């Protein structure tokens, strides 16, 4: 309530209860003044003329949103280990966002060297997007989330949305949202801000790799009465055409009545990490699989949850069907293969089909006396009755939520990049420094002022997401697979800082390590 | 068994206002290309606005109980329809509920898309056709598609002034919005229940 | 009518950590086959991780109101898209909700 | 109540009810010191000799008035669309003027480059003209109203009235109002000011 | 509770009772920012290659621990004389740690000569290690304890632990503790921190 006190206590503990884990977090933000307090618009021609596919018309507001979407914002790697090695699933229940210890510094470059003088009276304003009236930018896997290692300082991102476009031009129904319009709360040097949100009833996330291949769901000792056609040419004669049935049994496990069939598929190109086997010709974009909307092709990235590779072929991976995180200290453009982290989806090869394999043959013509039966592969297969499948994994570096588009008809709105799909995700938290004009002229001027005091702000942030957590009771006898840290000498402990002090996450941690039978 | 074929859900006395494209070449001239619409009605019941469409499909080979018509070459396994999981092909047996045969063709049946029970005192391996019981699914030919017939054509290219419109058949068709279908029959010799696999996402888990 | 194209649901200022395969032939050599990833970002909006994908489809013939561009040959019934039930073809009319034309 | 707190929350929402629309607004002002704190008089000869028609005798007080007369101060264009497309008429009923988060900076040009150092103790004073004793300058379509787009900063106008004149000279009944005379309220770095006004029973404006 | 007040009174008396001696103490600390707020690791090769015996792998956290382990922190030599000349033994029962009058200065070397300008809004954070989850570095006879003569100013030490090692390399079970993880309490210019601890039933120390 005053400039000589703190508005909150740094809180960063991670409690554990019988079936709920509360994971508080806190980082030190530093928000500059974006776009010099102007609502510029951005188009592809403005940012350099590009192809029709990479066309976008949108505005770049001066506000910055607080991003705490990625998992590693909340879960320290040990806590993530405790959550993946011991639980069949988890889901978030509520959060408690706090923002305190606001400092508003003023940077003056009037002298030769800038001096960061404090500014007690200046105000920085925040507001939740409680009704989701603005476009949603979280959940689209945008960098700038809360940094993983608490002892570092992160810069607040910048909030710029996109609307309808026609090339570089805007259709007249391209609504332009103004952020000053929303009722914002102004915060001084000693104020603080807090809102409590309750998560929607999102279903439990799967955290178990199935230990029973779907096409092996049956016991191998008793043969079902469902016969099956076995022979059609009972020999080699010119006119030998009979119909010999036979009982389907464990001797021939493949062809036999199965209640359920594997999930949907969308064929993806086969690209191998061993650079020798890949085709010499360039096939990054031209060979990939894309869906066309409004006449502009856009890459799948990553499509419905599928299996990265069949058993025993680790070197492969779908071209654009797997999340590919970047290692610490990795460049932006044209980074070699070894400096980028590829996530394989071999945990759900049991149920879902193989991402780089045709779903299966379907007979086209008629097995007539004059035309041989013909089978054409199914490259893509929409969902069918009786079809079961498992959604994509979430990784410690992966996202949590994503706002389901507010459309009439959607099917299984689990976001494709992995996570939880909610109609009302946790709202955005937009923050901007209230502009303070420097020295207006002593004569009137019917014009908006264009000389502001160069300033920024800094403080803390706190997020307390409480996760529901479903314990496991399985009668697996042999030791179930669990995630562990290799006990081999190395120059650096994994998930810990090196000599320079940069926090490096060496590998992505999927949350499918336990087992649960079909 | 539904007593009203899905593509005949409409009364045959009143024609709906939904027009439909009827003629494109209004004659035989080299450069005669017009667009003549016409009202869809009971005179032409086929092409007319329909709210709902028949259920999913997975094309199955056409094998006939009359042993003469079947192809001489062996096609039991190589010609059948299978789904690949973990790199090992496995026969469908019997796939989503479909219609064993169109009206009037009882001798046919999908190769591996119908429960085939065994009669009393039937051997295990290489049993002739007459000693094994085949279940036909002609009870749901109204709603579900025909198991041994392509779901339907879909236009691929553009009906341009230089390229003729082309239609390629749909061998397999995942479910679409507005699609209705009927599940498989249960028989006195058939099963009752089946444990739904404990996976995150399944659709209509009727075994 | 939705004012946000589904393939443009993301903000154009921050690039997601989801990489994507970018180059396979890193030049023009006979035996040059590498795997160069790159970060997906607003510079290349198309190929990038998207949670949701557009709805179902059933390809329909392209017929133009300008009578000149349409094919000379008759294609009203023979070229249309129909679903077969009980062995009798019947026209779609109008099929699942789709977009009549691109922008 | 202190220099380490805010005197108000930025409020700019525009609610809608069954038959009343409440249109709050907010902008960031920046008021300099006019006329070096002197009550100069202005005449046409002072501002360059002109014709008889363009003759005026008046004083240019150092005070600045808050102008929120133009419509676009309150109604965002979408809100104006909702009000013209759906209503036969409208009339204002009451307002609630607030003024908060006062900062009083001090600009010193003693150095070569001016440095805007903060000034905690300085006071800026406001007062409503509740009895309309001063000449009325709003409502004559003068620029300087609240700017339309909220995210910009506007400069407070300057208050200078006009009285009776004869050419460039003043008839002896040309009353000279002094603004120090009115009971003003002084505001420090952490104070705030607020007055609630009720509109007269003005008839409905035609919107058809 | 404000920047214009003190958060505690300098207390340094040493009372004496029938059979309990209470020895309060107080010194003026001065804590810099260590390792530029980074969690570097340190190995013998990093600090110059040495023999196998002098091998160590550990991290040098930016936190500083308060050390009051040595006796002369508490007992003035006269008090120590009164305690050794008259008592067969002693043992500690409880302590009451206080930390007040926090000042957070900002050193700027932008000019040629550094100027130590005060910084009212900055925060310095403390927390007790109540559950002993971190490695224990006190009690190993490390310098930097509270200085003996009260009228001097001591610099807070730096907290860096050691874990398992193999030469200069770390076995995979070499847990790396991060100090941001513990629930810390943030203190402004006018706040203060205090925790009361009770000593275990340690047996009487021989003094004979």
From TrEMBL, chain A:
Positions annotated to bind Ca(2+) 1: 344, 347
Keywords, sorted A to Z: Calcium, Capsid protein, Metal-binding, T=1 icosahedral capsid protein, Virion
Keyword Secreted annotated: no
Principal location: virion
Domain Coat protein VP1/VP2 Parvovirus: 1-490
GO molecular function: structural molecule activity
Family to which the UniProt record says this protein belongs: Belongs to the parvoviridae capsid protein family.
Designated name of the protein: Capsid protein VP1
Residues of the full protein shown: 219 to 736 of 736
């Amino acid at each position: 309530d005053g400039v000589g006190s703190s508005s909150g206590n740094w809180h960063c503990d991670s409690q554990w209860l019988g079936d709920r884990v509360i994971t508080t977090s806190t980082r030190t933000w530093a928000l500059p003044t974006y776009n010099n307090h102007l609502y510029k618009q951005i188009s592809n021609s403005t940012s350099g003329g590009s192809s029709n596919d990479n066309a976008y018309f949108g505005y770049s507001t001066p506000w910055g949103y607080f991003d705490f979407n990625r998992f590693h914002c909340h879960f320290s790697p040990r806590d993530w280990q405790r959550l993946i090695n011991n639980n069949w699933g988890f889901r978030p229940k509520r959060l408690n966002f706090k923002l305190f210890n606001i400092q508003v510094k003023e940077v003056t470059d009037n002298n030769g060297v800038k001096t960061i003088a404090n500014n007690l009276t200046s105000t920085v304003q925040v507001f939740t997007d409680s009704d989701y009236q603005l476009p949603y930018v979280l959940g689209s896997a945008h960098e700038g989330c809360l940094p993983p290692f608490p002892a570092d300082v992160f810069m607040i991102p910048q909030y710029g949305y996109l609307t309808l476009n026609d090339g570089s031009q805007a259709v007249g129904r391209s609504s332009f949202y103004c952020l000053e319009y929303f009722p914002s709360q102004m915060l001084r040097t000693g104020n603080n801000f807090q809102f409590s949100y309750e998560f929607e009833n999102v279903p439990f996330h799967s955290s178990y790799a199935h230990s029973q291949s779907l096409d092996r769901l049956m016991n191998p000792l008793i043969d079902q009465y469902l016969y099956y056609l076995s022979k059609t040419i009972n020999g080699s004669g010119q006119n030998q055409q009979t119909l010999k049935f036979s009982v389907a049994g464990p001797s021939n496990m493949a062809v036999q009545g199965r209640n359920y069939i594997p999930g949907p598929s969308y064929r993806q190109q086969r690209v191998s990490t061993t650079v020798t086997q890949n085709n010499n010709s360039e096939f990054a974009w031209p060979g990939a699989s894309s869906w066309a909307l409004n006449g502009r092709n856009s890459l799948m990235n990553p499509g419905p949850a599928m299996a990265s590779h069949k058993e025993g072929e680790d070197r492969f991976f779908p071209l654009s069907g797997s999340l590919i995180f970047g290692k610490q200290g990795t460049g932006r453009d044209n980074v070699d293969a070894d400096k980028v982290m590829i996530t394989n989806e071999e945990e759900i090869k049991t149920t879902n089909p193989v991402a780089t394999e045709s779903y299966g043959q379907v007979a086209t013509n008629h097995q007539s006396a004059q035309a041989q039966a013909q089978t054409g592969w199914v490259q893509n297969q929409g969902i069918l009755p009786g079809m079961v499948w498992q959604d994509r994994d979430v990784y410690l570096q992966g996202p949590i939520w994503a706002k389901i588009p507010h459309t009439d008809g959607n099917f299984h709105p689990s976001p494709l990049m992995g996570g939880f799909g909610m109609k009302h995700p946790p709202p955005q938290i937009l923050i901007k420094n209230t502009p303070v004009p420097a020295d207006p002229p002593t004569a009137f001027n019917k014009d908006k002022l264009n000389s502001f005091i160069t300033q920024y702000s800094t403080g803390q942030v706190s997020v307390e997401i409480e996760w529901e957590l479903q314990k496991e009771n399985s009668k697996r006898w042999n030791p179930e697979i669990q995630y562990t840290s290799n006990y081999y000498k190395s120059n650096n402990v994994e998930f810990a800082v090196n000599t320079e002090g940069v926090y490096s996450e060496p590998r992505p941690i999927g949350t499918r390590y336990l087992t649960r039978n079909l």
